Structure 1
Amino acid sequence: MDIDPYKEFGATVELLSFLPSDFFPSVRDLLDTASALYREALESPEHCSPHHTALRQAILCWGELMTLATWVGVNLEDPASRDLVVSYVNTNMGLKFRQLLWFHISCLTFGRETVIEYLVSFGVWIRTPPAYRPPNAPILSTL
């Protein structure tokens, strides 16, 4: 169906590709940040924003993923397969979750215009050859 996760929010998968995979923070940290700042809003019955809706969708599905992982951990009788499956869900389905959690949580804190402006600049920086790349990578701050 050629659905793009970020197209509605004015970004593309290509634009996010500029950031390296390693850059995105760990799932636990992102979830803690989301809970700390937006738990009340996320659980509220009002539609605060589209981004809030997207974050809720991402959370509830990751939850379902961990549920299936728990399912293979308690049912599968093979430790070889048990390990393989769980490893594809925490590493391969986790790197996509990390990317979406970062975009939405960052668009909620900084603003989506700011988030997309940060994606172009980090791109310019990572493209800079190391001999000229400044030691301070771009960072999103509101101080």
Structure 2
Amino acid sequence: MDIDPYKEFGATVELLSFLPSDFFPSVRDLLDTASALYREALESPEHCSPHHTALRQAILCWGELMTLATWVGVNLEDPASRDLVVSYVNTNMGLKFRQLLWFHISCLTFGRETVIEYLVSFGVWIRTPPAYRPPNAPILSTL
């Protein structure tokens, strides 16, 4: 069905399309950030928040995809297809996964209002042509 994984929280794929695809940190970086800030809450038997309830499932999906990639690499004796599949995973599913991880980790760390205002402001910045684009882009911070 047509499910948006953000409108449950107050955003949309059209609002996160302000951020380009080359903007999102790597999956390793984001998973390390999660392990750092919310490992004890993701490994807890509590609905601490919908962000947790969703981030757990996203991490489980990524883990299943990694198991798929290993299984492919070990079973399939066709390096061409092996590489094709692994690259497709790590690129497309990686992009989607890190979009979702960015959104959740940010709305947890900083806040819904702050994150939405940041998306709007970054859209302003990235629509503004370069000749009039300040260099001090918007950068989420607690400082």
CA shift, 1:125, in A, is 0.3
How much has 1:67 moved relative to structure 2?
0.6
In 2, Cα distance between the equivalents of 1:113 and 1:43? 27
Deviates more, 1:112-121 or 1:29-38: 112-121
After superposition, the CA RMSD in angstroms is 0.6
Instruction: String of CA shifts for 1:95-133, please: whole Å, max 9, x gaps.
Output: 000100000000000012211111110000001010000
Residue 52 of structure 1 deviates from its aligned partner by 0.9
Report the TM-score, using the length of structure 2 for normalisation.
0.98
SS of 1:134's partner is coil
**Could you tell me how far 1:12 is from its partner in structure 2?**
0.5
User: C-alpha offsets along residues 42-95 of structure 1, whole Å, 9 cap, x if unaligned?
Assistant: 101011110111111110100001010111011001011111000000111100
The whole-number CA distance in structure 2 between the counterparts of 1:115 and 1:57 is 22
Residue 55 of structure 2: SS of its match in structure 1? helix
Deviation of 1:137 after TM superposition, in Å, equals 1.0
Secondary structure (helix, strand or coil) at the match of 1:131 reads helix
Task: Give the 5 Å matches for 1:15-54.
Answer: 15-54=15-54
CA deviation profile, 1:1-42 (whole Å, cap 9, x unmatched): 110110111000000000010000011000000000100011
Q: Which blocks of at least 5 consecutive residues in structure 2 are unaligned?
A: none
Gaps of 5+ in 1: none
- Number of corresponding residues: 143
| Identical counterparts, % of pairs | 100
